Design a protein around this nucleic acid. Structure first.
Ligand SMILES: [Mg+2]
Ligand SMILES: [Mg+2]
Ligand SMILES: [Mg+2]
Ligand SMILES: [Mg+2]
Ligand SMILES: [Mg+2]
Ligand SMILES: [Mg+2]
Ligand SMILES: [Mg+2]
Ligand SMILES: [Mg+2]
Ligand SMILES: [Mg+2]
Ligand SMILES: [Mg+2]
Ligand SMILES: [Mg+2]
Ligand SMILES: [Mg+2]
Lengths: 129, 186, 82, 13, 82, 149
RNA sequence: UUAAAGUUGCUGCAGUUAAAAAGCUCGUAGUUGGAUCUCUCUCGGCCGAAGCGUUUACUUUGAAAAAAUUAGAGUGUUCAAAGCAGGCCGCCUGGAUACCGCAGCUAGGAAUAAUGGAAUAGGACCGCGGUUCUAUUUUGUUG
């Protein structure tokens, strides 16, 4: 059945992107999906989005800028040490120059970059570029 | 006719309870108003200095206040002249249990008392003569939020002169930014 | 793009589609740079002014080059509301 | 116990 | 195609989407208010009604159930509610 | 999909957004509860009751009006099924399939559907055992099946 | 024997026709699992000892992790592989540092993921009553 809603969300937006669509309807939504999208949004890869609140689970409608090539998830969530991070990004990202690994950490959800700053490890969620 | 939990009355509470007394003597509602009480009251600034009255009632009496709410608002308004009077139930917010705690936690907190639930019962109450239709949380490119709230289109002419008063009210208790729209229809 | 010193090191700076924002390829010959003219609002004659669009070859096959041209025009007010 | 709480409920009610 | 307001659908269209796939899920049935002609009495009924319902005093049979909606007996007026 | 069938389909109810009891409804919480009580004393499951109210009495969801969900009302007032009414139904249906299955031995299909219905029984049961609605010695047994219903 | 081998594939391969998906369904263990919830009193000089908060996993931090080897400083073995030496006109110095899976300790963090807390209220929190028990002070000491 449906497990890992995050995965299904980002598949959907990545597809609506390759299709070159303007908006997306991604459902259901999560307090995780939301903070992920937000971290994505601060760097601009996406745009503003709006949460249709239904009495059950969310739907989220996302506005889109062509700036997103790939958006992905890594299942299972792996526990990523600080020391490991390098390896991870060097595997995942197109370049040292750009793109992000998003992890949840004790601090909050964030970018590999910002966590490097805060000196925290955590679990991997996904990545984008 | 006021019963604060902290047990100390105020100057707003004084005239407002007195207003209710006057509505017990001079109005058709006497029995109901005898039964009921209010816990608290406030005044605030919204929409270019326009003034709003906030009336906190004890929760189990709320659905009773809902009976007479419109009449009460007319009369209590003309007693207080131009102001906008809105009723909100007094709500317990039980702090989120953490790894660091004493035992203030013996039995678990019920969903009913909790941040999100309360903010939505507040929102529920504010608009009272209007139902709530649908609610849309929009996010700014900033990372800030705003909440569109949809109301019954039938009750429109009833509440549509208030509107931005709510927007101020909600902001002062809750702390979020809210707009109000009347949908065309379904 | 820019090195540390701030020079632009690049052969050329490619144009992105106006509709869908993809990069228009060095050799993509299905691409369009379309010129739409501006009238004088009093007369209805031609100014010498124009607003320009680009559309990559992807969107042309999908046929939705048309839709996008259109709502681009609306966003420029070259097409009336309704 | 059961009887005590039930009777406590009727006597509180 | 490539431009749609998912946020503001046309009400026409939303009457046409399936009851779970609307932007927010809306029941397709409504409570109706039935009056058999020879009686004064008002009854509240469900639009899609299983069982069979009755006006008490006249033993008037209000409706037969069917697959989708209950079909009321002839001459019997009804008013959808709000 | 369906758990035991190939078929995958959409048939359900969608509850309206508004949880507020509408205006027209003239019944109290308590009126409805008395209604419920006598309707259970005519020996009906939760399902029955709910639909009955929905049809004649204009109660969309008993839940909204009286604040509690149906089965809790009945179990608080003490009139409740011993075993949860669905598990009841499953067992009755399983019984029936056996009763026809003794006389027609040559039927393979019925024999197979029996196994399905049984497996469903056990999943359900073990659910009611982890959730303590059943004494955890409780066991579906083919022979005493006829009794429980 | 290692790479080449993305020809053992966790990263990372395949399974319509090239090698390959079970005749079909039920099914226990196994793996996997939807939304949802923003710390406090007894002692000591307002702060330490005393508590606990449901418990874990995850994470960061501390201390412990034999030397040799490996990574890595210093040093013209005449160079280097080495060695741990040397260097100044009796003095001046070296002989560092990192890494050390997992397990086990330590102190922060509370996002994620488990898990618990009240449903015939044998629930919390209040203070009032009885019944039984027994420790010890006190009636200048002993009973
Ligand atoms: Mg199955
Ligand atoms: Mg090899
Ligand atoms: Mg290799
Ligand atoms: Mg191969
Ligand atoms: Mg062949
Ligand atoms: Mg073959
Ligand atoms: Mg096959
Ligand atoms: Mg199993
Ligand atoms: Mg989950
Ligand atoms: Mg060593
Ligand atoms: Mg070495
Ligand atoms: Mg360790």
């Amino acid at each position: 059945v449906r497990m890992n809603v995050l995965a299904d969300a980002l598949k959907s937006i990545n597809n609506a992107e390759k299709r070159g669509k303007r908006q997306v309807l991604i459902r259901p939504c999560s307090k995780v999906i939301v903070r992920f999208l937000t971290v994505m949004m601060k760097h601009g890869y996406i745009g503003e989005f709006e949460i249709i609140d239904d009495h059950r689970a969310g739907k989220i409608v996302v506005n889109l800028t062509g700036r997103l090539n790939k958006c992905g998830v890594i299942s299972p969530r792996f526990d990523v040490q600080l020391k490991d991070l390098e390896k991870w990004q060097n595997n995942l990202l197109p370049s040292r120059q750009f793109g992000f690994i998003v992890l949840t950490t004790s601090a909050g959800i964030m970018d590999h970059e910002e966590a490097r700053r805060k000196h925290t490890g955590g679990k991997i969620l996904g990545f984008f570029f | 006719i006021v019963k604060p939990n902290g047990e100390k009355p105020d100057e707003f509470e004084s005239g407002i309870s007195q207003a209710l007394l006057e509505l017990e003597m001079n109005s058709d509602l006497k029995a109901q108003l005898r039964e009921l009480n209010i816990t608290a009251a406030k005044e605030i600034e919204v929409g270019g200095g326009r003034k709003a009255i906030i009336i906190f009632v004890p929760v189990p009496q709320l659905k009773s206040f809902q009976k007479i709410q419109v009449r009460l608002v007319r009369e209590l308004e003309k007693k207080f002249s131009g102001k906008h009077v809105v009723f909100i139930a007094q709500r317990r917010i039980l702090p989120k249990p953490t790894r660091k705690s004493r035992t203030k936690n013996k039995q678990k907190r019920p969903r009913s008392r909790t941040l999100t639930a309360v903010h939505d019962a507040i929102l529920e109450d504010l608009v009272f003569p209007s139902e709530i239709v649908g609610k849309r949380i929009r996010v700014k490119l900033d990372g800030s939020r705003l909440i569109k709230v949809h109301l019954d289109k039938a009750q429109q002419n009833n509440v549509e002169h208030k509107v931005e008063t709510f927007s101020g009210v909600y902001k002062k208790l809750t702390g979020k930014d809210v707009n109000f729209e009347f949908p065309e229809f379904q | 793009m820019q090195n540390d010193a701030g020079e632009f090191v690049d052969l050329y700076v490619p144009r992105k589609c106006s509709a869908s924002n993809r990069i228009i390829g060095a050799k993509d010959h299905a691409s369009i740079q379309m010129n739409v003219a501006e009238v004088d609002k009093v007369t209805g004659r031609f100014n010498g002014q124009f607003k320009t669009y680009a559309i990559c070859g992807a969107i042309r096959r999908m046929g939705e080059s048309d839709d996008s041209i259109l709502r681009l025009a609306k966003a420029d007010g070259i097409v009336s509301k309704n | 116990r059961r009887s005590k709480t039930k009777e406590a409920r009727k006597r509180r009610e | 195609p490539l431009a749609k307001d998912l946020l503001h659908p046309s009400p026409e269209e939303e009457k046409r989407k399936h009851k779970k796939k609307r932007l927010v899920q809306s029941p397709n049935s409504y409570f109706m208010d039935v009056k058999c002609p020879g009686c004064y009495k008002i009854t509240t009924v469900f639009s899609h009604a299983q069982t069979v319902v009755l006006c008490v005093g006249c033993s008037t049979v209000l409706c037969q159930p069917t697959g989708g909606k209950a079909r009321l007996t002839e001459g019997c007026s009804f008013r959808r509610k709000q | 999909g369906r758990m035991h069938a190939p078929g995958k389909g959409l048939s359900q109810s969608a509850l309206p957004y508004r949880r507020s009891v509408p205006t027209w409804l003239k019944l109290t919480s308590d009126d409805v509860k008395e209604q419920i009580y006598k309707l259970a004393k005519k020996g009906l499951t939760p399902s029955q009751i709910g639909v009955i109210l929905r049809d004649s009495h204009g109660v969309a969801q008993v839940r909204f009006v009286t604040g509690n969900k149906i089965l809790r009302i009945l179990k608080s007032k003490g009139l409740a099924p011993d075993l949860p009414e669905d598990l009841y139904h499953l067992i009755k249906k399983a019984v029936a399939v056996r009763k026809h299955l003794e006389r027609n031995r040559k039927d393979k299909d019925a024999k197979f559907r029996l196994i399905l219905i049984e497996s469903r029984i056990h999943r359900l049961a073990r659910y009611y055992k982890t959730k303590r609605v059943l004494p955890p010695n409780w066991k579906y047994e083919s022979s005493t099946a006829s009794a429980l219903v």
